[PDB]
Design a protein around this nucleic acid. Structure first.
Ligand SMILES: [Mn+2]
Ligand SMILES: [Mn+2]
Lengths: 929, 295, 295, 295
DNA sequence: AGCAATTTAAATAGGGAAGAT
DNA sequence: ATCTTCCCTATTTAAATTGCT
């Protein structure tokens, strides 16, 4: 590897970086180094070139592509190294940036006018309840609305009038309404409980007129008259001139505001709100010290009076203005040019040369990567990102362990921690034992990286470790919940960090089908927000349903419409890149996405069907599923075994179902040597982690290394009874599976856990589908709702899987890829597709995906909750002693193959099952006994 | 400027994109909106194409034309399907040598001499193929390329008109497009409006060979209004007649390799400078067009 | 600033100075020095010129060329053009050389039309002398100047060869030089190497004449390699042959007046372009070349 | 220093001549006797060498050793036929991996095991030839080279004493050196005190292979003081086996090519860097001693 | 002998203004 | 407008000296 490093630096920051860059490369003179070094040498040079201080101006070239660029060095757009560098370049009708500047400046000088009431003064001094009857943002909104109703609010002297209690402060003037919504929602968004309003309201002001004081601001309301008697000590020199210059800025630019569309207004006001909380939290974090008394805004850690309200308003204004400037004029730090990506894929990765069919100069890109598992999907996503140049992306993945797997792939192929940042925000205690030096695994949290210039506008220089890893990451391999808060939050400033993260970075969401329906709705909201700033969305899901692919394209198309009309460019359409392991297709799609997507789906189906059938599923006829499991285990051991040894996966639905199947199979008298494992999610930290590592090392069938992790000498049935934790994110390879039916994507995923690593075709049948789910004996009205898309609004007419599924069927992604809306009441696949198009629709609703008008409100974050689960309290095992109503028990010790013990950790119990003892056990975790 | 590098001996070529070209301190330099001013070696530049979002002052054209740099623009009729008017300013302030115009027009007016000259320039396609070989693509000596070159020569030998010629072009180019595509394992349809790299790199190389061909023409004084190939789809003049000598030998292998080996636009552009100066293609075309006019 | 030049009959050679040409609200405009924007009507102009201090952009270039408004880059004054493309019959629909160009070629080829056109260019040079009457210069109707004119007319009409026409042309040109020397009380002998006011002023006026003749030859698509009087090896000899028409009628009296009053070179440039704008000297050369080539 | 570049992936490579080696402002550098200070990349240097008139300091040697750069001194040869004594500072402050030294000791103390290792290391030069094939010089797979390495392998297979290994060593060195001499058409005699370029390029490559061999041995903690091949003529240590595994495969054809093309010594230094870096000869030697140690 | 702190000063870059075309 | 020349303007590099280990 031959690199060349050039320095642009002034100071002796052309000198103390010269020591480190002259420790690793030869000096060719004139502050230019050039030579041969290894990739780990590149990583060491990066780590000790960035850590040496601020102001390092370093460009590295590997062959002729830029390896890395330290700082905001413009370096190369076409040629490299400019010369007569300057300021003043373009100076356009920027319009919408002047609009955002005027809105943020006018609102930020009015965002805390409502702290001047006597209640907030005695709240800061501390002789009343610290919770206000009406929040000060609403009081400042009442001030601004009363001033606007009285005088002309855009060109007049200010003077705060006598204000009363107003239920609504939103009128008709679109720009005033924007300023009012920025003022009122500078801490939290208003929440609308009204069902008719949630049913009908769509527009900007027409929804904003329904935002009343009862949506969170009106806490208790007994001291309203003191909350609206206000002093007017803000009339000073610099506050009045700042208010005048920003109001006239808005006055001069609001003529382009009425030429915007609804989508524009929503996205622009979201940006304005994010910059306003950025400036407000930035000025509230630091201590300024000086004060002019008689009025105060915030308190220090000692509770003393600080940050008087005139200079508080001025500081929040300038900090929000500077926030806006750096978030709207940033050339963000991108990743290194990974040299182990750009070469050809060989063999089964040979489809990854589809990036040589995509244009490298497209400003936008919507990848739908429909490639099957085991083909290197995430490596292909990184290849697609690097085809357009240097990489800046957020790999948002479900589960901690899947982020760990993608991080380990990124580490061992070409990516160091100067470009990658693995973020899992829980600090799990799963450590690697055996040998620390001989590990060559366990990707960790260090991020030598490079701190971006956006950290100076965040509160108190961003944060410590976690938010520095969030914001400053070129490549952010993260759990997805660090990105879905970009679309907005209920309370606080947790929106700004993923918002500013997704503003300048691409978004790569892998296996989006494993998320929930509301989770997929907020993920497509994130896709729309990412496309709002021209970034590229890579979706990587093999079993995509047309509905999902369509609504994600429509979210990207609305976002790219926002980005196109935001830079005053005519919208040519979205560069959609359909991708699988058999080919690629790049089309400029502005309309008719459905026929092209279904034609690519049909081409992928015909490229999947002439291949040999790997998963032949038979739906059993035996009604009782206990003895159906027994007979199917006996049949698939007598048919599918490797010299007497067979691996079976009993995929069931819930935990007590799993322990019921386990306790039946343990007490089942047979000549077969059944060896039973329980693989559900309710387990203690230690025990769970141990199951994972063992299962990953015994079900690895790409080699014969497993022969030494199990007793393959004696003919044995190694059976793993598992819940849907096996069908998501597990690289497992079973000889056969017996599936309790809950949804068709569960069938396809548990087919993907059988012969995942081998290529031998089954002869007779490798999957035995149960006749009924076990909830049929508990609830015959609805049985597929647990881990399925059946529900109270979408009920199957019959629950028989002979009626709702094929008796003999080759299970692949084809049934999920096709998409059928008719006959959803008597087939599982059409039931699935129905729900997917009836929840992820092209409407705005309130919990929908095109959400417009409601982004202003708190409604999409309350009624569409990301990871909406049950109450979930956590019973914690502390050194062998349980906390709550747990009561350790003893398992049946009949056929347990492996049982790992646990002493620490915690189990997640729903509040429903907290009533009784969860009865934790070493073999199977939680049950009802 | 002393003697001034012979225009066959100029090695730098550029197609600038999204910049303001101006003169600073007597420097031909393009400035981007990020504040970066990159200079251009104007006394060594063959051509400067200007892509979308580009702009150039008067003085930059004044000291590019005094140094013999041809400046064209990639829009207007630059959609490359009609190929009608790629807006291409030449330096005619320098009074060019005349004799290549004289021998060129003596053969132009005479239609039989024009037909024979067209056949020589059609044979220059296969001459280019043999002279400029590539070690990362199609071998010229394999059975398919040798068969199609033999078919092309035996068809252009017995050719009678320019309509018969237009057809032989269809065959050579389209089937060489295809033969590469099947060896590069890609279903490929030539489309100037297509987004795949196999077409955007091909259009970039089309502009590069346009610049090389137009610089070779202007060098000798030859214009563009005297083409040898007349047809319905051959609008564009003599610059495309000179340029399609080196599509399938140079521009097409470099574009196909670039797309297959995932090069970026910048490195394909550079691979084009490396092939155009390592084998000295400008002097090749200039000397070969001297062979074409001659008497 | 904004400058209008009538060239053939109705199309106007616009000259733009100290302005930035771009596209505003969907049509080509330019911001001037005074900060006021000026649009351009597409219908009344075909040639648009970019003088000193002028920048144009890419989409403005493309939309100008798509409206038939073909652009050239010139030194400030409008008659010192260094960069353009070649006139076709239509800019978008086809690519054919202009009828004027083809007619010129045919006339040049057959020896009889070349001799007749050489006689005619000298006939119109004598016409130019009378047509463009100056105030400070000698009287064209004076007996000595009319005797020189009739001597040249007899010599051109009775000649049957080109070297006779060269001797007669040199006799007429230097006889007018001798007449203007007899006016301005000096021993004037025409040499390019002299540093006196008359010779160097005539030299840079001749360079201005070469520039305006180059613009007139370009504007009808006439190439710079078909001289009438001068030899086939003379680089750009047609520019010199066309500029000969106004060298002894316009450039010579202006240059001798300029050396007599002794003012500087830039105000001689403004006097030359003022005489070009006032009497439509370029339009005279355009109609001269049309009448020569049409025959 | 995080993860100091594994010794096998260290890339830089020098022998410093007529310069005092020092540290300025953080980095190790060398200052010649004209004021020129050239920096040494100590984090990526494999070895440095010190010729006549060189002088290294204490903290420079410390920054080389703690980073892990083996440093020797080129002069010291005083006999008539042998490269006598090269003085070499081992970085022992870095505590080395141990069991590879234990494996080397368990093969060194057993006489039949040392002979068995002597056998495989003698055919290691034979497979070095087969793997590392240059583009110039001889071809390895010709009839003469294959016949002599076949006779060498047949003789070293039936060998039973170290003196037979020394004799067969001598016939191997005479055979290769003379065949290269034949190819490059020169008369060759290996004298370390000769002014002929084929000889002092070979001594420069002796120093280069010496440095490569101590870096390979020190990377696995192997001392030079355990020579598995020993004799009266062959008394240099283990460096005179792991250094001349790669004479006739790497250095000697490179030395003959450098003495045939005949520029200065610096192209030979850079060519040794290029071939030791491109084919990863250091990592190749380390991996070969790896498959030696555990077998 | 290398370096560090710290001064001292020479020079590099840029912005504004005015004069040319 | 574009570009050049020149005057601030101070920001930015290189040398110089010298205790300190
Ligand atoms: Mn507040
Ligand atoms: Mn505040």
């Amino acid at each position: 590897m031959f690199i060349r490093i050039k320095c642009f630096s002034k100071q002796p920051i052309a000198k103390k970086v010269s020591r480190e860059v002259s420790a690793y490369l030869e000096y060719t003179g004139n502050n230019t180094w050039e030579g041969h070094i290894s990739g780990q040498g590149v990583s060491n040079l990066q780590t000790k070139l960035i850590n040496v201080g601020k102001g390092v101006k370093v460009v590295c070239n590997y062959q002729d592509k830029v390896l890395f660029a330290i700082g905001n060095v413009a370096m190369s757009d076409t040629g490299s190294v400019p010369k007569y560098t300057t300021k003043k370049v373009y100076k356009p009708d920027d319009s919408i940036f002047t609009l955002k500047q005027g809105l943020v400046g006018v609102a930020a000088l009015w965002h805390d006018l409502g702290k001047a009431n006597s209640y907030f003064q005695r709240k800061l001094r501390g002789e009343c309840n610290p919770s206000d009857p009406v929040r000060h943002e609403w009081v400042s909104g009442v001030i601004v609305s009363t001033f606007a109703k009285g005088n002309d609010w855009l060109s007049d002297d200010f003077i705060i009038p006598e204000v009363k209690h107003s239920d609504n402060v939103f009128g008709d003037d679109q720009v005033l309404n924007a300023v009012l919504w920025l003022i009122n929602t500078h801490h939290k968004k208003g929440l609308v409980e009204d069902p008719i309003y949630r049913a009908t309201k769509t527009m900007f002001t027409e929804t904003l007129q329904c935002v009343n004081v009862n949506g969170g601001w009106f806490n208790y309301g007994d001291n309203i008259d003191e909350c609206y008697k206000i002093d007017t000590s803000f009339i000073t020199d610099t506050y009045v001139k700042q208010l005048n210059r920003y109001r006239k800025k808005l006055l001069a630019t609001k003529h382009i505001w009425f030429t915007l569309g609804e989508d524009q207004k929503i996205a622009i006001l979201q940006e304005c709100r994010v910059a306003l909380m950025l400036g407000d939290s930035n000025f509230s974090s630091d201590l300024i010290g000086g004060d002019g008394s008689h009025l105060y805004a915030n308190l220090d850690e000692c509770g003393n009076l600080k940050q008087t309200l005139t200079q508080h308003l001025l500081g929040v204004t300038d900090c929000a203005l500077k926030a806006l400037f750096t978030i709207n004029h940033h050339k963000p730090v991108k990743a290194n040019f990974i040299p182990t990506i750009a070469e050809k894929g060989e063999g089964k990765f040979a489809w990854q040369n589809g990036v040589n069919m995509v244009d490298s100069s497209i400003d936008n890109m919507f990848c739908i990567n429909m490639a099957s598992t085991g083909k290197g999907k995430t490596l292909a996503n990184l290849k697609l990102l690097q085809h357009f140049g240097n990489v800046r992306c957020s790999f948002g993945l479900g589960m901690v362990s899947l982020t760990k797997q993608t991080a380990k792939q990124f580490l061992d192929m070409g990516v160091d921690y100067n470009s990658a940042a693995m973020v899992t925000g829980f600090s799990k205690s799963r450590f690697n034992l055996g040998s620390e030096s001989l590990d060559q695994d366990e990707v960790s949290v260090e991020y030598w990286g490079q701190t971006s210039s956006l950290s100076k506008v965040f509160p108190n220089n961003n944060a410590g470790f976690k938010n520095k890893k969030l914001l400053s990451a070129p490549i952010l391999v993260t759990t997805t919940d660090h990105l879905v808060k970009a679309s907005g939050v209920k309370k606080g400033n947790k929106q700004m960090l993923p918002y500013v993260r997704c503003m300048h970075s691409d978004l790569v969401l892998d296996e989006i089908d494993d998320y929930g329906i509301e989770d997929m709705v907020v993920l497509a909201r994130l896709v729309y927000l990412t496309a709002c700033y021209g970034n590229k969305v890579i979706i990587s899901s093999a079993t995509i349903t047309p509905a999902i692919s369509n609504i994600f394209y429509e979210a990207y198309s609305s976002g790219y419409k926002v980005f196109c009309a935001n830079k005053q460019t005519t919208y040519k359409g979205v560069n959609v890149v359909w991708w699988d392991e058999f080919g690629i297709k790049v089309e400029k799609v502005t309309d008719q996405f459905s026929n092209l997507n279904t034609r690519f789906v049909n081409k992928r189906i015909t490229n999947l069907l002439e291949s040999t059938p790997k998963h032949k599923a038979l739906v059993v006829d035996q009604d009782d599923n206990m003895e159906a499991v027994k007979q199917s285990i006996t049949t698939l051991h007598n048919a599918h075994n490797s010299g007497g040894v067979s691996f079976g996966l009993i995929r069931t639905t819930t935990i007590k179902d799993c322990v019921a199947v386990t306790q039946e199979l343990q007490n089942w008298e047979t000549d077969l040597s059944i060896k039973i494992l329980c693989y559900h999610s309710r387990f203690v930290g230690d025990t769970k982690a141990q199951m994972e590592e063992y299962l990953s090392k015994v079900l690895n069938r790409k080699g014969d290394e497993y022969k030494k992790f199990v007793d393959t000498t004696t003919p044995t049935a190694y059976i793993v009874v598992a819940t849907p934790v096996v069908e998501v994110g597990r690289d497992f390879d079973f000889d056969w599976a017996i599936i309790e039916p809950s949804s068709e994507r569960s069938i396809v995923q548990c087919a993907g856990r059988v012969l995942r690593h081998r290529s031998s075709t089954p002869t007779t049948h490798n999957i035995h589908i149960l006749k009924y789910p076990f909830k049929f004996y508990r609830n015959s009205n609805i049985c597929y709702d647990v881990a399925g898309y059946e529900s109270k609004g979408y009920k199957l007419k019959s629950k028989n899987m002979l009626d709702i599924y094929k008796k003999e069927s080759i299970v692949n992604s084809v049934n999920r890829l096709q998409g059928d809306a008719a006959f959803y009441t008597k087939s599982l696949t059409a039931l699935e597709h129905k729900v997917l198009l009836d929840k992820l629709t092209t409407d705005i609703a309130d919990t929908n995906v095109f959400v417009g008008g409601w982004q202003l409100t708190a409604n999409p974050h309350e009624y569409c909750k990301w990871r909406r689960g049950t109450k979930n309290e956590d019973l914690v095992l502390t050194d062998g002693k349980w906390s709550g109503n747990v009561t350790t028990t003893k398992p049946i010790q009949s056929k347990i193959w492996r049982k790992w013990q646990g002493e620490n950790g915690s189990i997640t119990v729903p509040e429903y099952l907290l009533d009784k003892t969860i009865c934790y056990n070493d073999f199977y975790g939680g049950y009802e006994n | 400027m002393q003697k001034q590098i012979l225009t066959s001996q100029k090695r730098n070529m550029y197609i600038l994109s999204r910049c303001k070209v101006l003169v600073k301190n007597g420097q031909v330099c393009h400035l981007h909106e990020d504040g970066n001013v990159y200079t251009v070696p104007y006394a060594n530049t063959v051509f400067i194409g200007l892509a979308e979002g580009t702009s150039i002052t008067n003085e930059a054209m004044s000291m590019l034309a005094a140094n013999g740099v041809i400046v064209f623009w990639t829009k207007g009729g630059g959609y490359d399907m009609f190929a009608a008017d790629i807006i291409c300013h030449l330096p005619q302030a320098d009074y060019r040598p005349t004799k290549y115009m004289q021998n060129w027009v003596r053969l132009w007016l005479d239609e039989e001499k024009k037909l024979s000259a067209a056949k020589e320039i059609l044979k220059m396609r296969v001459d280019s193929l043999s002279t400029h070989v590539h070690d990362f693509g199609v071998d010229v000596e394999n059975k398919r390329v040798s068969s199609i070159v033999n078919k092309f020569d035996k068809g252009v030998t017995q050719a009678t008109s320019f309509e018969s010629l237009l057809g032989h072009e269809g065959t050579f180019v389209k089937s060489l497009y295809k033969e590469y595509a099947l060896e590069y394992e890609i279903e490929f349809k030539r489309d100037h409006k297509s987004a795949d790299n196999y077409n955007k790199f091909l259009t970039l190389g089309n502009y590069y060979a346009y610049g090389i061909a137009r610089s070779s023409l202007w060098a000798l004084g030859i214009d563009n209004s005297f083409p040898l190939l007349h047809g319905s789809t051959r609008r564009g003049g003599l610059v495309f007649d000179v340029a399609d000598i080196i599509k399938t030998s140079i521009i097409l292998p470099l574009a196909f390799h670039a797309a297959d080996q995932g090069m970026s636009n910048t490195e394909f552009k550079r691979s084009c400078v490396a092939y155009f100066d390592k084998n000295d293609i400008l002097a090749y075309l200039i000397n070969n067009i001297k062979r074409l006019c001659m008497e």
